[PDB]
Paper text:
Dynactin is a 1.1 MDa complex that activates the molecular motor dynein for ultra‐processive transport along microtubules. Dynactin is built around an Arp1/actin filament, which is capped by pointed and barbed‐end complexes (Schafer et al, 1994; Eckley et al, 1999; Imai et al, 2014; Chowdhury et al, 2015; Urnavicius et al, 2015). Dynein binds dynactin in the presence of coiled‐coil cargo adaptors, such as BICD2, BICDR1, and Hook3 to form a highly processive motor complex (McKenney et al, 2014; Schlager et al, 2014a). The pointed end is important for binding dynein‐dynactin cargo adaptors (Zhang et al, 2011; Yeh et al, 2012; Urnavicius et al, 2015; Gama et al, 2017; Qiu et al, 2018; Urnavicius et al, 2018).
We performed signal subtraction on the TDR and TDH datasets individually to focus on the pointed end, which slightly improved the density around the cargo adaptor interaction sites compared with previous maps (Urnavicius et al, 2018). The majority of pointed end interactions cluster around four sites. In our previous TDH structure, we noticed two coiled coils at the pointed end (Urnavicius et al, 2018). The main one appears to only contact site 3, whereas the second coiled coil binds to site 2, using a different subset of residues compared to BICDR1. It also makes a small contact with a loop in the p62 β‐sandwich. For both adaptors we saw a large reduction in binding to the site 1 and site 4 mutants, with more minor reductions when site 2 and site 3 were altered. The importance of site 4 for Hook3 binding was also not expected. Our structures did not show strong density for Hook3 interacting with this part of the pointed end (Urnavicius et al, 2018). However, reexamination of our new TDH map at low threshold reveals a weak tube of density contacting site 4 that appears to connect to the main coiled coil of Hook3 via a flexible linker. Although we cannot establish the location of the Hook3 Spindly box in our maps, the observation that Hook3 also depends on site 4 raises the possibility that this site is the major contact point for the Spindly box motif.
Numbering used by the authors:
A (entry chain Y): 2 to 88, 106 to 182, 219 to 464
B (entry chain J): 12 to 390
C (entry chain V): 1 to 179
D (entry chain I): 189 to 376
The structure:
């Protein structure tokens, strides 16, 4: 993904918004015939979990607990998951040696149950204001409803019947003179250790304190398990109910697991001329493909193009064997030996075929970029078939063109 | 119905959380770390192409709705707090991102000043908003914002950060750790905005009116021989590990004065209240004066509220404002949440009102049909 | 380089046995307790100490040069002892990297010159970036990237790591041959 | 006030003119590019060209919809929130306040003066806005001179030249003897 530079050769997406992304990041949509990007697809929320103590919490409990773990804590000074140490328990960090004793929080007899965050200072005033505005909003709703049904009736405010407990909040008292800056600030050395930085100030927003002794450790933030759903298609992919300590997908779907992935095996000279060898591995068990197209003339956004890649080669039938094969186990005649193609095809191993592209570098100053279209026989299986019961000839016949953009090192 | 989310996109920091809460859940720098870019690009930028702005806001809102808040965007409503006279194309884009990409049920474009008034409970009050870009004031009288008597000056965070950078480069004394124990000037051509902001918050403070008025005349040096008050002690600040910048005591209490300096025009952060209040209707004068509100993170700076209220009462006695605003009692309101998170708290208090929210707010079905967001400009 | 893995020619001196290749330059003081079941690679000047260990490594494990894998000591009131670490399947430890980690999960790409702290657990399908410090007793979830001197959540990985990482470690092993 | 309200709309387009010097170039922007639409609602729905204006420094600014919806506040000052009649209203009200016999002749003789009538399509809008308020089938002639800005002075220049002016003005010795009223009583 990162070790090999997947962020070089990119695949194009069809729709409203055109995007150039690596095949590793993209997803293939099986309901229809069009691969779509992580940007294009809509995101959902499945499950919440703590990154320290991996515990799958339900959606209801998260809303009550404000998307936080009760047991785990993150240090305020540096941003790292704290650890309980005994002597009878105090909270301490590994990276920085900030303790819970420093700020002056008393040690608890019970390990987890004892620790808590103080109640918000303006929580009582809050509820009183909500209830005042709630009652006041309810009056406007009744007024707006009464006005709307009178318009809908269209009786011109005809008086058939006779027309027409209060909550009163006291408004906050305005101070005559606000407290001045203490005379300590004048003629006193300022230790930058004692006062807190903006980053660690703002992590505790309810009462962001200037001094470090006031700054208490906040609960550790819960992380999210994303599930993707498309515009046209319904489902796409999702994750299990035990995503904590699991790398399994409930429905595995990705562009590399359907569309044939292209990789630049060899990179030649960048001095005005060369011959680059690229591989075209298949992922499907049995299929056919072809890199025939030259991306037309000024069509399909070929603005990035800074070279003329010929790739004048007819289709080559490659197949993947999901099994541990030996070094040159058997030599097939019709697949390998019959299309010898010594100039075009470099090598043909198991689920692998090297192809020579004749690029024209140094058309611009530098940063050589090549546009070429790749075709493949997509066994869609859109119609109802149990273990390939249906023939799926019309599906296999369908030729899907992916506009690839390979970027040479330069 | 579900508890509607509140977002407040600012140049420096964005406030995020859920309605009917004591304060915002997440507050973070309004930036995004794009691959290739060493410094992260700012998400809100006025006067750029729509497509480039659309991509930045799409990237940012995604981070807010998944990494910071954990909730589906399509399920529950939005309460977008944005200041009055926010650029047209920016607000149009922000809504278009929420309605098209995320497919939110309904957005409510509340003005920050009217939201700040709800938190106190008082129906009428003057509201000063000392933000990053511009320090804006807007009188709110019994629910109606008075756009006629608006006021704005570029004396916020950005103007203060720039002033600090200028002063530090003049009196530049850093200990690199390479025979740089001796005072070394301007080793680095520019100082990054992240450092300048941290220096401002920790080192620099707002002086008293009496001491400040002397500092103004001192640096001017208006036919006087060393008429400055005794500064605080010099604070040593680390830059990128090894390099230790010695911050001069004069810089700490002089950097702030650019806000409260008259500069001939008679245009300070203090004057902007009195300039607006004098332009207000004659009946509204005494009610607005008595109910002052000071929001924005720039006013959090230590001893700002005392200097402002003092500087007001001094500028009152000045002959221009002496006639109209002579015998007026200026009293400041202390909001429940902190000065930075007053704007957000209003939107949450408003978001808790499910019945009024749905009616006032613009539904997606209306936007998809029309493609016209309602504004204070003509329809 | 552009998806394709590049050639690396090894010298004559290297201990090739049952698929497992271990550079003779690289000392592994404590050969008894350390175990390499699969076709593992250990590059030159690397350390795998047997300080009361049980260092089990993967099928296609890779450890680049100047890199150390030492077990951590558990500060227990009952008895202070070195906790035996278990490197997962298809693990890629990058060059000049320090590892004091207990239980490193399968299909992981540990970055270059990155110090992992004492008693540090890593779950499967994660990636630590280069010049990063994971503090002692930290956990990293699957499909995650931890970075910075603090060592905290930077973002998420590509969905296809389980399938992709197999190609990387196996290709490197296959491409890494004698001159 | 139109210059002040244009500055507000220019900040709503995203261009600040905070300085007192920068207020002068807002007055220049107004004077250069600001057209009064006959129907304001139709021009708002229509997508603007966004005509570029060049500043003294050299920088370009796209004004867009602020161009036409700024001077509209003359004809409809309730939009911003200023309690006034309006330029179309004050003209009609002034005629309607006068005696019934003169109304027809006063509608038949209207003269535009000053600089805040030179707005492009001012006469076109005013004629339309006056007609609907004024009585039906009444002849409304809004006779603008070519020198509207300098009309007030030219009048004084003609008045001053006449021998009657010699009688009208107040002498320095008259002001010393008569008192303060001298200037007020001779005014008319
Ligand atoms: N707690 C604080 N203490 C001191 N200064 C602060 C604090 N929070 C923010 N600031 C400063 O004041 C500014 C407040 O800007 P803010 O109101 O968050 O942005 P915006 O005006 O774009 O909504 C910040 O840029 C920062 O420089
Ligand atoms: N060509 C013009 N187009 C639009 N507005 C103009 C034009 N010329 C002047 N103005 C406006 O009219 C003002 C001039 O008013 P003026 O006629 O001098 O008033 P007075 O009659 O009191 O002397 C300018 O400040 C400007 O706002
Ligand atoms: Zn689809
Ligand atoms: Zn936890
Ligand atoms: Zn810490």
């Amino acid at each position: 993904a990162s070790l090999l530079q997947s962020e070089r050769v990119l695949y194009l997406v069809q729709g409203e918004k055109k995007v150039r992304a690596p095949l590793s990041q993209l997803y293939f949509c099986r309901y229809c015939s069009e691969l779509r990007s992580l940007e294009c697809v809509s995101h959902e929320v499945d499950s919440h979990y703590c990154p320290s103590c991996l515990e799958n919490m339900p959606s209801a409990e998260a809303k009550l607990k404000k998307n936080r773990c009760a047991n785990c804590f993150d240090c305020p000074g540096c941003m790292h998951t704290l650890s309980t140490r005994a002597t009878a328990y105090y909270l301490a960090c590994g990276f920085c040696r900030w303790t819970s004793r420093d700020v002056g929080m008393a040690d608890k007899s019970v390990a987890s149950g004892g620790w808590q965050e103080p109640d918000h200072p303006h929580t009582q005033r809050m509820n009183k204001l909500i209830e005042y505005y709630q009652q006041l909003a309810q009056k406007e709703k009744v007024e707006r409803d009464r006005k709307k049904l009178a318009r809908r009736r269209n009786y011109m405010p005809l008086a058939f019947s006779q027309h027409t407990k209060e909550i009163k909040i006291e408004p906050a008292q305005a101070v005559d003179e606000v407290e001045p800056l203490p005379e300590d600030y004048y003629t006193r050395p300022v230790n930058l250790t004692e006062v807190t930085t903006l980053q660690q100030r703002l992590l505790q927003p309810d009462f962001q304190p200037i001094c470090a002794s006031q700054l208490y450790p906040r609960h550790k933030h819960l992380l999210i398990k994303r599930s993707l759903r498309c515009r046209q298609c319904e489902h796409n992919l999702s994750k299990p109910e035990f995503n904590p300590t699991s790398i399994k997908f409930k429905i595995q779907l990705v562009a590399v697991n359907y569309i044939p992935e292209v990789r630049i095996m060899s990179i030649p000279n960048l001095r005005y001329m060369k011959e680059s060898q690229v591989l075209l591995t298949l992922t499907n068990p049995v299929e056919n493909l072809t890199h025939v197209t030259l991306l037309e003339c000024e069509e399909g956004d070929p603005d990035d193009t800074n070279s003329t890649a010929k790739v004048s080669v007819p289709p080559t039938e490659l197949v993947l064997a999901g099994k541990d094969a030996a070094a040159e186990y058997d030599e097939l005649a019709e697949p390998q030996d019959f299309p010898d193609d010594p100039d075009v095809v470099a090598f043909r191993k198991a689920n692998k075929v090297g192809v020579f592209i004749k690029v024209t570098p140094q058309r611009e100053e530098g940063d050589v970029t090549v546009c070429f279209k790749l075709k493949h026989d997509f066994k869609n299986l859109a119609a109802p078939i149990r273990p390939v019961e249906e023939a799926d000839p019309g599906a296999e016949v369908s030729w899907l063109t992916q506009h690839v953009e390979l970027s040479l090192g330069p | 119905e579900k508890t509607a989310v509140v977002i407040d996109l600012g140049e420096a920091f964005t406030k995020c959380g859920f309605a009917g809460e004591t304060g915002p859940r997440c507050i973070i720098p309004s930036v995004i770390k794009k691959a290739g870019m060493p410094k992260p690009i700012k998400v809100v930028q006025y006067n750029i192409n729509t497509e480039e702005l659309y991509s930045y806001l799409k990237e940012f809102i995604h981070i807010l709705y998944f990494r910071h808040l954990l909730v589906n965007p399509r399920d529950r409503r939005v309460v977008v707090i944005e200041s009055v006279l926010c650029p047209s194309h920016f607000r149009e884009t922000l809504t278009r991102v929420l309605f098209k990409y995320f497919e939110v049920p309904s957005v409510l474009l509340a003005p920050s000043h009217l939201m700040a008034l709800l938190t106190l409970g008082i129906n009428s009050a003057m509201v000063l908003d000392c933000g990053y870009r511009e320090s804006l004031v807007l009188p709110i009288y019994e629910g109606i914002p008075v756009l006629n008597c608006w006021g704005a000056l570029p004396l916020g965070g950005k103007a203060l950060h720039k002033e600090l950078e200028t002063q530090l480069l003049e009196q530049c004394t850093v200990d690199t750790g390479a025979a740089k124990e001796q005072s070394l000037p301007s080793v680095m051509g520019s100082i990054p905005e992240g450092v300048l902001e941290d220096i401002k918050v920790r080192t620099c403070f707002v002086s008293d009116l009496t001491r400040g008025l002397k500092i103004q005349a001192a640096k001017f040096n208006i036919d006087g021989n060393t008429e400055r008050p005794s500064p605080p002690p010099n604070v040593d600040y680390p830059l990128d590990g090894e390099k230790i910048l010695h911050v001069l005591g004069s810089i700490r209490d002089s950097v702030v004065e650019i806000l409260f300096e008259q500069d001939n025009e008679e245009k300070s952060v203090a004057t902007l209240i009195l300039d607006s209040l004098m332009q207000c209707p004659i009946d509204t004068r005494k009610q607005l004066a008595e109910n002052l509100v000071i929001i924005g993170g720039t006013s959090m700076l230590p001893g700002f509220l005392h200097r402002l209220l003092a500087e007001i009462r001094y500028l009152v006695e000045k002959p221009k404002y002496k006639k109209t605003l002579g015998t007026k009692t200026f009293r400041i309101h202390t909001p429940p949440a902190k000065a930075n998170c007053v704007a957000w708290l209003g939107g949450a208090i408003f978001g808790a009102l499910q019945d009024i929210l749905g009616s006032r707010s613009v539904s997606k079905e209306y936007y998809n049909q029309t493609g016209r967001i309602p504004d204070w400009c003509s329809l | 380089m552009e998806l394709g893995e590049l050639l690396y020619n090894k010298s004559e001196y290297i201990e090739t046995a049952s698929g497992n290749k271990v550079s003779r330059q690289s000392v592994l003081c404590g050969s008894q307790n350390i175990v390499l079941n699969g076709k593992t690679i250990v590059m030159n000047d690397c350390i795998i100490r047997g300080d009361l260990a049980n260092v089990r490594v993967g099928r296609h494990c890779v450890v680049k040069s100047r890199s150390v894998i030492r077990p951590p000591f558990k500060k227990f009131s009952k008895g202070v002892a070195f906790f035996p670490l278990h490197i997962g399947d298809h693990v890629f430890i990058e060059e000049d990297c320090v590892v004091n980690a207990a239980q490193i999960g399968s299909y992981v790409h540990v970055g270059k010159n990155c110090v992992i702290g004492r008693r540090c657990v890593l779950k499967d399908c994660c990636k630590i970036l280069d010049n990063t410090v994971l503090p002692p007793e930290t956990v990293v979830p699957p499909f995650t990237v931890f970075s910075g001197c603090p060592g905290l959540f930077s973002g998420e990985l590509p969905e296809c790591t389980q399938e992709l990482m197999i190609d990387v470690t196996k290709s490197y092993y296959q491409k890494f041959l004698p001159l | 006030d139109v210059s002040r309200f244009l500055r507000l709309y220019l900040r709503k387009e995203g261009y600040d003119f905070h300085s007192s010097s920068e207020f002068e170039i807002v007055k220049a922007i107004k004077e250069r590019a600001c057209y009064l639409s006959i129907n304001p609602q139709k021009d708002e729905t229509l997508e603007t060209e966004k005509a570029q204006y060049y500043l003294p420094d050299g920088s370009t600014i796209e004004i867009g919809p602020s161009r036409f919806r700024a001077p509209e506040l003359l004809f409809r000052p309730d939009l911003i929130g200023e309690e006034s009649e309006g330029i179309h209203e004050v003209l009609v009200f002034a005629i309607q306040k006068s005696d019934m016999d003169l109304r027809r002749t006063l509608f038949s003789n209207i003269v535009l003066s000053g600089g805040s009538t030179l707005f492009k399509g001012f006469g076109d809008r005013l004629l339309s806005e006056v007609k609907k308020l004024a009585p039906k089938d009444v002849k409304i002639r809004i006779s603008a001179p070519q020198e509207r800005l300098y009309s007030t002075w030219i009048g004084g220049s003609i008045l001053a030249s006449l021998d009657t002016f010699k009688k009208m003005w107040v002498s320095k010795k008259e002001y010393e003897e008569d008192g303060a009223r001298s200037i007020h009583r001779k005014t008319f």
